[PDB]
């Protein structure tokens, strides 16, 4: 929500997940893991300790 | 003479959580970065609030 953020706004990100019609496939794993990764707009691969950057 | 003696309990001394501090300097505002993990690498920890 509201993509103009100045500096100091701790702002929640919202993720809505829905498994597809291939929910019938595996079913012996009941958990899967969701890495949220962070890219710069110009450059790539911000390291996950992420100082002077997004803190989470 | 209610003697409840010799309850030979063994107690452990190992603080299970471990906190690392990092002080990010900034102009007129300040940031704390906090790395939290277990003591030893086979006993995992649940956390509730900080």
UniProtKB/Swiss-Prot annotation, chain A:
It is found in: Golgi apparatus, cis-Golgi network. Disulfide bonds: none annotated. Present with 259 molecules/cell in log phase SD medium. Specific subunit of the TRAPP II complex, a highly conserved vesicle tethering complex that functions in the late Golgi as a guanine nucleotide exchanger (GEF) for the Golgi YPT1 GTPase. TRS120 plays a role in the YPT GEF activity of TRAPP II in concert with the two other TRAPP II-specific subunits TRS65 and TRS130. Belongs to the TRS120 family. Part of the multisubunit TRAPP (transport protein particle) II complex composed of BET3, BET5, TRS20, TRS23, TRS31, TRS33, TRS65, TRS120 and TRS130. Interacts directly with TRS65. This is Trafficking protein particle complex II-specific subunit 120. It comes from Saccharomyces cerevisiae (strain ATCC 204508 / S288c) (Baker's yeast).
Swiss-Prot record, chain B:
It comes from the Eukaryota. It is found in: Golgi apparatus. Specific subunit of the TRAPP II complex, a highly conserved vesicle tethering complex that functions in the late Golgi as a guanine nucleotide exchange factor (GEF) for the Golgi YPT1 GTPase. TRS130 plays a role in the YPT GEF activity of TRAPP II in concert with the two other TRAPP II-specific subunits TRS65 and TRS120. Required for both the cytoplasm-to-vacuole targeting (Cvt) pathway and starvation-induced autophagy through its role in ATG8 and ATG9 trafficking. Part of the multisubunit TRAPP (transport protein particle) II complex composed of BET3, BET5, TRS20, TRS23, TRS31, TRS33, TRS65, TRS120 and TRS130. Interacts with YPT31 and YPT32. Belongs to the TMEM1 family. Present with 432 molecules/cell in log phase SD medium. This is Trafficking protein particle complex II-specific subunit 130. It comes from Saccharomyces cerevisiae (strain ATCC 204508 / S288c). The gene is TRS130. The chain holds residues 753 to 802 of 1102 of the full protein.
